[PDB]
Design an enzyme around this catalytic site. Structure first.
Site, mmCIF file in Angstrom:
data_model
loop_
_atom_site.group_PDB
_atom_site.id
_atom_site.type_symbol
_atom_site.label_atom_id
_atom_site.label_comp_id
_atom_site.label_asym_id
_atom_site.label_seq_id
_atom_site.Cartn_x
_atom_site.Cartn_y
_atom_site.Cartn_z
ATOM 1 N N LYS C 53 -33.759 -39.307 -31.817
ATOM 2 C CA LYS C 53 -33.265 -38.962 -30.491
ATOM 3 C C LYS C 53 -34.299 -39.627 -29.575
ATOM 4 O O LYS C 53 -35.484 -39.310 -29.658
ATOM 5 C CB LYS C 53 -33.261 -37.452 -30.292
ATOM 6 C CG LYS C 53 -32.648 -36.999 -28.976
ATOM 7 C CD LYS C 53 -33.004 -35.555 -28.667
ATOM 8 C CE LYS C 53 -33.638 -35.426 -27.293
ATOM 9 N NZ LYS C 53 -34.860 -36.267 -27.168
ATOM 10 N N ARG E 76 -41.035 -33.308 -27.497
ATOM 11 C CA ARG E 76 -39.758 -33.268 -28.189
ATOM 12 C C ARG E 76 -39.440 -34.561 -28.920
ATOM 13 O O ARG E 76 -38.437 -34.623 -29.630
ATOM 14 C CB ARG E 76 -38.637 -32.957 -27.207
ATOM 15 C CG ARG E 76 -38.452 -33.998 -26.142
ATOM 16 C CD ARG E 76 -37.385 -33.561 -25.178
ATOM 17 N NE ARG E 76 -37.180 -34.508 -24.097
ATOM 18 C CZ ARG E 76 -37.868 -34.491 -22.965
ATOM 19 N NH1 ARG E 76 -38.806 -33.582 -22.775
ATOM 20 N NH2 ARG E 76 -37.623 -35.382 -22.024
ATOM 21 N N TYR E 77 -40.273 -35.583 -28.773
ATOM 22 C CA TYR E 77 -40.061 -36.903 -29.340
ATOM 23 C C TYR E 77 -40.944 -37.176 -30.542
ATOM 24 O O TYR E 77 -40.472 -37.673 -31.565
ATOM 25 C CB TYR E 77 -40.344 -37.952 -28.268
ATOM 26 C CG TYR E 77 -39.300 -38.054 -27.205
ATOM 27 C CD1 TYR E 77 -37.965 -37.842 -27.494
ATOM 28 C CD2 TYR E 77 -39.659 -38.283 -25.892
ATOM 29 C CE1 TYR E 77 -37.015 -37.925 -26.515
ATOM 30 C CE2 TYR E 77 -38.723 -38.352 -24.909
ATOM 31 C CZ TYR E 77 -37.408 -38.175 -25.222
ATOM 32 O OH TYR E 77 -36.478 -38.252 -24.222
ATOM 33 N N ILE E 78 -42.220 -36.852 -30.432
ATOM 34 C CA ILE E 78 -43.237 -37.297 -31.361
ATOM 35 C C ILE E 78 -43.475 -36.241 -32.426
ATOM 36 O O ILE E 78 -43.188 -35.057 -32.247
ATOM 37 C CB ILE E 78 -44.522 -37.634 -30.595
ATOM 38 C CG1 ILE E 78 -44.922 -36.444 -29.737
ATOM 39 C CG2 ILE E 78 -44.293 -38.816 -29.712
ATOM 40 C CD1 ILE E 78 -46.219 -36.627 -29.039
#
Lengths: 77, 72, 630, 227, 81
Positions: C53, E76-78
């Site tokens: 995402k 929320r990405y890594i």
DNA sequence: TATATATATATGTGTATATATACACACATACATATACA
DNA sequence: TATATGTATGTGTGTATATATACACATATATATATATA
């Protein structure tokens, strides 16, 4: 320069008490809370109208936010 | 009633010049994507065939674009 | 510029699947392509599935591979004459075009179009709109519109499943962000973290006029009030939730969660496709959302109306038994299905084809003050006060407007200009449907419904009355009772078979002399010769999700592990008495099960009446304790 | 013109200004004129102020003081882990050299004949089996050695009554015999390296030095990704 | 909390999910943004970072020399490991 | 008083980001305040 | 007219304290804006 930037001076979180600055102004308290969730608690508490008949209410109590951590003036004067 | 510039924008070295037409704008969605693009457009000698900031730029789309097909 | 070629894009992977050993993964660009690839597999316990995402999830050793081939993966857009009407359909100001296109699913892509795109690297704009944007809008309908069986969305169903699993051992409360991290870990939630915490906050609120009348969670802290519409809760850093355990125990029975179709994500299962509650919970709460194309809006029904209708359907000696079946065959209405008036003190009127809800004032001419004591259904207080303050035609009669309301009861106080009660009546005329004061003080609203749900196997469904939703709900619960009773029957026969060989091994272990033998091979051989049945111990003790053909197909295909992991603790005589009496209880239960599979009007008709009574007493207890369950 | 991990900065000078830099930004023998112009040195100035165990600030003067304060804690920690290992090994030898003779004698002891576990515990104690605390012999988690040898010989017969019938085969007897032999050899090694010079556990800490060093090398070679 | 969490298998987690874990089981009594910033800066590894021998392996965009490691991703990405 | 615009609000489940304060200290940039004068 | 000389600001690091904002999607309601009637 002040007049150019006076429009940005003229949004704090402040609930005025009903008797702030009048004839019974010295009968009043200002419950300075620390954030906004604290003000949610205090506004929940000051509205128990008949579950707390001996408590306070907004007739002599205000609310304001301290904005986190206060600046000190002892190092800036 | 009558009485700054671009935010999160990295221009290319050749924008609006004599080789203006051969430059790209890699418009990304936020700022973590621009962190990826900055990581990748600076492969210096490990990617001689890839792009760099001599002919590429970066700008953020701010999340979700407003539609103009129903505000006109 | 779209004609001459100016607008371009990259094309990155959404899923990479890594095999052990090989240094090239398998890349997927769409989620349903991955699901179709993955369900065809036979074992996925040597692959790793990564979901990306956003672009920032790509680490270094794959951004280098993505940028050795940068110019290889830039595609350019072309447009034809068949594109302007599609932009007007998908992004124009009218929804009827969008409703009538958006009912049908996505149309897959031909081989010539796919080879042309992946060869010359240009994309038609219309062919982009008829795949990617339409797949987005169908996915947004699935996320933002409730199912009609359980009555909840997809995020809230993940929250319910992860909350049943999180508070399993002991029901200790956690912070909202810690529970959110749990349900984003174990339920495979592929989105941001802020909206999940907002849904966990609003899925636990309970006040007069909240969305959920029967919340899943008990909320511990400050969760907002009527006066701002629940918009003034605490941060998730502060407040807590725990599971309202007996309502979830009675409404969603735990032995029925083994029998539902599940949503598989990334290879392993996440949550059901749908829950099927004991009562039709889709029509029992409130709600108002937009979505793509459609709109969702419901107003909750009475509890006693729904209990009367379900008990009239199921129970055989209620007087309204066969007449209700006639009305289900002909789609006519007999028993009334009124709106809910619980936790609301005003009054409700039906004028034609709609319901109207009214407030309550209290006129006084002694001090020219009207004391407002209630607002209509789902009306916040400060929004009402600012709306009554902005309207300049109404401000010409009032001096001051003051609030004195408690945290759960409205009390607004207006003050009129002197001698101004008389001039209201000629200005604001009294119809039969509303009073002059209720015209003046904005004190009624219409209950206008949009009963647009999603159905099993996806896609929209649209009802015209609440009776249609109830009549569509009932057969699912009927067949789920039949499934659980047949599964229980098979498991009970197989467990009788298992334990009435443990008993004879305990009786014959001294004559058998198990210590004399060499390993498990010779022991299994000498146990196969004395008439011990080979069994599958794991499927008998824990039949997790096994269907009945799976349960009688791999049961008799095991070994003697059921008899070989017996402890020496249980070779004693009190253990023999214990096992013999539990075998007697199991076969009495088996006789009860095979008697329940026959009764009128359908199998499992008394158990469902018992569960109606259990859900009713749990709802009554919850309504008395302010939904705290003390 | 920098890379992702490599610096490459390029200035441009207006013409005839290098000599003005040389005569205007003066050169000492500690820094160059070009480094004085381009801000190209800094001082490695330290403030070694740590907290100590059982709370409180401590302020050191050099890094040698920190190393010399660090060493005795690790030394004493090796001594107490070897004492703990010695105690647990003796207790587990005592535990399994009852289970093996129970497998040898349970064919004619015939525990299947008795009524409940109290009669069984009585008849097991009437033949010399030691009462043991099985849930603390097999898993000493946070027990000190005083409460290890203080409450573990004061248990029950759960170690011997909770055996599966899989355990009563000949290969399981053989495996328990060789496991008793390995624990006896390890107990001999523990008592042999409790007495070494200079302090107990002096070769073990050399081995852990070597393992940490090659793990640091293998992590530096793979850009700290451990491929 | 990282030794306790990744015990079974060394499967990746996000930053906010691992932060929720170490705030639940290690009885952390403070905010979440500072804990997630601490996890991010405990995972970083570039020439000139604070840690020369980091506890974690970072998976994703964890910032560079140029902005001083202040150009990482959102939590929320890594991922960490 | 009428027919007609064009902008405007709110609901749930989603997509993206912004900003104030404390605490210590080595270091960098801005005068400015004199003190010889000139 | 150059020189010092004592003033005043100003980011910066880790671990804390308290907040802010844009966008999509449907549909019912709204409050003022507008012709042309005259």
């Amino acid at each position: 320069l002040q007049s150019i930037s006076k429009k940005d001076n003229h949004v704090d979180k402040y609930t005025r008490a009903r008797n702030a600055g009048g004839k019974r102004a010295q009968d009043c308290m200002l419950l300075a809370a620390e954030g906004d969730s604290a003000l949610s608690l205090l506004r929940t508490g000051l509205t128990l109208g008949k579950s707390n008949p001996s408590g306070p209410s907004f007739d002599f109590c205000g609310m304001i936010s301290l904005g986190g951590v206060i600046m000190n003036a002892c190092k800036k004067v | 009633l009558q009485s700054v510039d671009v935010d999160k924008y990295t221009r290319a070295r050749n924008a609006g010049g004599k080789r203006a037409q051969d430059c790209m704008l890699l418009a990304a969605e936020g700022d973590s994507a621009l962190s990826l693009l900055r990581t990748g457009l600076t492969l210096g000698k490990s990617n001689p065939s890839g792009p760099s900031f001599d002919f590429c730029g970066m700008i953020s789309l701010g999340g979700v674009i407003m539609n103009a097909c129903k505000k006109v | 510029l779209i004609i001459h070629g100016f607008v371009k894009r990259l094309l990155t992977p959404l899923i990479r699947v890594y095999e052990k050993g090989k240094t090239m993964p398998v890349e997927f660009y769409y989620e349903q392509e991955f699901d179709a690839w993955a369900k065809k597999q036979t074992s996925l316990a040597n692959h790793t599935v990564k979901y990306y995402k956003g672009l920032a999830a790509h680490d270094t050793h794959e951004v280098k591979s993505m940028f050795k081939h940068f110019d290889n993966m830039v595609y350019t857009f072309t447009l034809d004459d068949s594109a302007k009407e599609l932009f007007h359909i998908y992004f124009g100001g009218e929804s009827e075009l969008r409703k009538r296109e958006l009912c049908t699913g996505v149309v897959p892509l031909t081989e010539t179009q796919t080879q042309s795109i992946h060869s010359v690297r240009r994309i038609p704009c219309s062919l982009h709109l008829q795949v990617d944007t339409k797949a987005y809008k169908l996915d947004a309908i699935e996320r933002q519109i409730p199912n009609f069986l359980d009555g909840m969305t997809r995020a809230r169903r993940k929250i319910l499943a992860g909350g049943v699993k999180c508070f399993a051992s002991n029901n200790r409360e956690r912070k909202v962000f810690q529970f959110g991290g749990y349900v984003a870990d174990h339920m495979f939630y592929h989105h941001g973290d802020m909206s999940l915490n907002t849904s966990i906050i609003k899925a636990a609120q309970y006040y007069p006029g909240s969305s959920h009348l029967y919340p899943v969670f008990i909320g511990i802290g400050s969760f907002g009030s009527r006066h701002l519409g629940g918009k003034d809760a605490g941060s998730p850093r502060y407040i807590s939730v725990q599971l309202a355990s007996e309502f979830i125990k009675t409404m969603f029975p735990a032995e029925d969660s083994w029998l539902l179709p599940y949503v598989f994500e990334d290879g392993q299962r996440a949550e059901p496709e749908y829950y099927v509650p004991v009562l039709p919970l889709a029509i029992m709460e409130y709600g108002a959302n937009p979505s793509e194309g459609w709109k969702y809006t419901t107003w909750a029904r009475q509890l006693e109306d729904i209990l009367a209708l379900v008990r009239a359907y199921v129970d055989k000696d209620n007087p309204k038994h066969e007449l209700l079946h006639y009305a289900i065959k002909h789609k006519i209405t007999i028993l009334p299905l009124r709106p809910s008036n619980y936790n609301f003190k005003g009054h409700l009127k039906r004028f034609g084809q709609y319901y109207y809800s009214y407030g309550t004032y209290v006129i006084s001419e002694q001090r020219n003050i009207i004391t407002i004591t209630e607002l209509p259904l789902r009306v916040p207080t400060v929004a009402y006060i600012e709306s009554i303050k902005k309207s300049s035609n109404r401000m010409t009669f009032i001096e001051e407007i003051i609030d004195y309301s408690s945290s759960e009861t409205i009390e607004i106080l207006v003050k009129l200009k002197p001698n101004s009660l008389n001039r209201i009546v000629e200005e604001f005329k009294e119809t039969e449907e509303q009073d002059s004061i209720e015209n003046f003080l904005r004190l009624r609203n219409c209950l206008h419904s949009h009963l647009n749900f999603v159905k099993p196997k996806g896609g929209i469904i649209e009802f015209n009355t609440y009776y249609e939703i109830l009549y569509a709900w009932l057969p699912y619960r009927r067949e789920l009772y039949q499934k659980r009773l047949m599964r229980e029957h098979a498991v009970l026969k197989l467990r009788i078979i298992m334990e009435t060989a443990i008993v004879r091994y305990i009786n014959e272990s001294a004559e058998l002399n198990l210590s004399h033998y060499e390993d498990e091979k010779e022991a299994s051989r000498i146990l196969s010769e004395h008439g011990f049945p080979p069994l599958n111990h794991t499927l008998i003790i824990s039949p997790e999700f096994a269907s009945i053909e799976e349960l009688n197909q791999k049961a008799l295909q095991g070994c003697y592990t059921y008899i070989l992991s017996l402890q020496a603790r249980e070779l004693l005589i009190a253990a023999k008495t214990r096992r013999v009496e539990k075998i007697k209880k199991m076969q009495a239960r088996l006789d009860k099960v095979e008697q329940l599979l026959q009764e009128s009007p359908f199998p499992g008709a008394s158990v469902w009446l018992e569960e109606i009574d259990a859900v009713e007493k749990a709802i009554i207890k919850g309504r008395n304790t302010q939904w705290k369950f003390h």
